Amino acid sequence: MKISKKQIEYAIEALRANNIITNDNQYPKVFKGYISSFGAAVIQSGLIPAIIFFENEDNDANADRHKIIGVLKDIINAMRQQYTVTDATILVSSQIPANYSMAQYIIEHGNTDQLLKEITEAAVAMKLALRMYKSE
Amino acid sequence: MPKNYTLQNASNLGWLFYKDYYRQEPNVDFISTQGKESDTTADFFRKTNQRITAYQLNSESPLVAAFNNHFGTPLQLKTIYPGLITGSGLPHQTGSKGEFKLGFQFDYTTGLPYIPGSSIKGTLRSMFPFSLKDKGSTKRILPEYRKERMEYIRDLIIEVTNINEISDTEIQALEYAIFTNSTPSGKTIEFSLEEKDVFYDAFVADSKDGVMLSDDYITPHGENPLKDPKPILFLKIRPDVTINFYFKLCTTHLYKEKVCSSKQIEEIKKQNDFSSSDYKMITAHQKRNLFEKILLCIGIGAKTNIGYGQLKKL
Amino acid sequence: MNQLTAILKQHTPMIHFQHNESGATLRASEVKPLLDKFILTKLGNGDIREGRLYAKKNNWLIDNEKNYALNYKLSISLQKKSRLEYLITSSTFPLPTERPSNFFTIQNSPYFAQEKCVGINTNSTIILKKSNSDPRKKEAEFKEKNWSQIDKKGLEWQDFTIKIFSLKGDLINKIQTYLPAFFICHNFGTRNNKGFGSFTVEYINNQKNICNVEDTLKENFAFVYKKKIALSRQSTLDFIYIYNQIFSTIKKDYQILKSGYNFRNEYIKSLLFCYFVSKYPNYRWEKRKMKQLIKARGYELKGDHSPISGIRENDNSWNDPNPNGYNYAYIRAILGLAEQYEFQLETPYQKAIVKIKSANNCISRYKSPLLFKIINNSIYLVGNEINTEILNKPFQYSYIEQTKNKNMRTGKSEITERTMHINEIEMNYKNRINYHYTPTSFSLIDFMQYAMSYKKNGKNILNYIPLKQ
RNA sequence: CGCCACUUCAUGGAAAUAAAUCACUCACGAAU
């Protein structure tokens, strides 16, 4: 599991687009804990429980931790945008619709290993991209 | 099936807790905010919790018998109320009602609740003086920590063994021999295979007439007394459950405030410049008694400051 | 030393939600957090911020910057595992002539939470049945399975042990001095402000403690009142008689303070209502305006007596003078914030439910600021100043009409709700001085001075001795 | 005495740190 520089570029662009990393090139410090906790939750509980926990918006958290799910969605869409025609025969190279619940998407698409590897790689890339920058 | 865990008719408790817990049933809907609070979701999680908490363990279990055959004679202690929590930090949470929101340490292969040997080793080392690392941050609390723990350990050693005086350097050497198998400076002592102190994983051995798992509540009332508290539900090991503590301990020889090997100590004995004043011995039985006293004093697991994880003699 | 061992005595039963286990006792998960606050408060001589600086200096805190937690371990274990199990309800009911030897009943209590456990429901612990004899007595049956599956039980234990361990010797010595006062000043359980969970320290490290509970209560509480409760006891004997009389008295006296007593030729006005009429703003019951507004839509409210409007021997009016209007506020909120009010419409299957929700969604609950302590069969009513945050805050009332469906060919069918029946409500009346808003001035010491000095027919309604006013 | 319930269901911190990072022997031998 090697994180390519293109995945890290996707992570940086997604983190900027979802208003986690401001124009000052700083981020709220709680988001590194959010990303680490999501990484641990995926491997301990599972993809569905972790995404459900991190995707809800009625939480009593300091910051908008539901934005890491949007960052994941953007990274996965960017990765699927560069799937070759040969990949598209085995791999579902279809953009996640957006405005769609990510948990709903994963439930509807079975529980294929493809989504699990994609989300694991995207979470690691998000972690590294956040480590590229500075806490507020 | 529901009770008497066994190897022929059971579901893996860890599997039930982690992978099968949030199984997608035809009509459950804990994705939505409305469905997370619904009675259907609460009933689903109640049924799952009842399945998890319905298993008991017999004393004559082939699983625990195999553990005894592999790791040696267990040290048997009992859990008192409220019980025992381990692995509390493992992520098990979605935001639903009736759900277990704290992690639990389950053996992967057997599914039995267990305390990993690293937890036991750390809990035993915590009451030895030389467990806090000499760091810039820890420098301000290092001296008091060492003083308190060294007095406690000195009293425990005098109580357990027939040693009349033990010095601070002797306590340092003994702790580093037990937990690091090394000199306090970092050097190595040429030890035999049987001269290693091993801390195996503790296991649940007997539930007797009840189940070995139960559900408990912590309700943190906030700093604002006018706002509603949040109930948190978690999984605990029931009171009066036998815990088997497996160790592999050797005899530690101390000559002139340094730790000696067995061949070293025999060679020193045959020397004519040998005195019994500066030779000290603590045997495996005495080490086990000392560990037992430490465990009965501080307990093991999570939330031990508020009574969770306190142990009693069988 | 490093280990502090104490033996605790129980004066009133504790309502435990984990009664199922035979080892169930006082939970250290609520004793240690409260004891940490108590010790820090006494370390700073009445304040908590200087006390934590004292513990910060002495390295007694687990974290020096975040919390109040002190570095010690708490372990509460039962010595002898035999319990006395109590059923605590608010309604009197006949006693079954078939019970386990440890089953006891507290009949008239301030614990209105398991009222469904006595009645017709098949899930009830005691099943009430009309007498096969003259239809006046009622028969009670003990359902053992329903008893086992009850959420909260009243448990009283023989003397048990609280064990405190810390390698910090100086912390233990301070805990020793404050531990007896902590148990005299705090109650534990699910109704602890009403008297459930009274424990006292008897032996500390095998040394008997001589602690004056009256003096201990004086230092820690702003006012302390003691009740001259007759004992009779036959001759000691029944603790159930003593328990039932004490808890019946507490409910009667508290219900005289908040709301009133309406049973016989006897009627006692709410002393809280009486207090607010006698002060300058001259606030009146929010219950007055709800009753007025519900009567406005021609709902026949049950009762032959018009709502009271003042203090005098009788002021039985349905109207509020004429030139101005009576000044209204949420009176009983400062003495315990309820969730809904029922008003018992005329037809004996329908009633009005008014629901309080708080406009800003900022006040969800309010614990009673009054603490009832029962030490050695003596009732002590203590307290401090109320939370000033509750004063002057808005509340939204949802008026709901509820008619209990006339049974079914199954069971009761109370899903026949009704939309919020239309009422002319106020928005910002009298410059936010209305029955929506809690009063802007209240002192508990002033209120309790008025309450225990209040006389009807030359006798104090609440017969209490003013130990500290 | 009769009747009767509603409410709340996780946040914050720690997310790797240090020791060892190649060592010794042979570095051409014999015949031509």
Automatic annotation (TrEMBL), chain A:
Q: What keywords are assigned to this protein? A: Antiviral defense, Cytoplasm
**Where, per UniProt, does this protein localize?**
Cytoplasm
InterPro entries from the UniProt entry:
AF1862-like_dom_sf, CRISPR-assoc_prot_Cmr5
Gene Ontology biological process terms from the UniProt entry: defense response to virus
* SUPFAM superfamilies given in the database record: AF1862-like
Keyword set includes Cytoplasm: yes
Q: Which domain of life is it from?
A: Bacteria
One GO cellular component assignment for this chain's record is: cytoplasm
The UniProt similarity line reads: Belongs to the CRISPR system Cmr5 family.
Q: What is this protein called?
A: CRISPR type III-B/RAMP module-associated protein Cmr5
UniProtKB/TrEMBL annotation, chain B:
Q: Which residues cross the membrane?
A: none
Recorded hits in InterPro entries, A to Z, give:
CRISPR-assoc_prot_TM1791, RAMP_III_fam
Domain called CRISPR type III-associated protein: residue spans: 77-312
Q: From what superkingdom does this record's organism come? A: Bacteria
* GO biological process terms held by the UniProt record: defense response to virus
Ordered alphabetically, the record's keywords are: Antiviral defense
PANTHER family from the xrefs?
CRISPR SYSTEM CMR SUBUNIT CMR6 (PTHR39965:SF1)
List the protein's name.
RAMP superfamily protein
From TrEMBL, chain C:
UniProt name for this protein? Uncharacterized protein
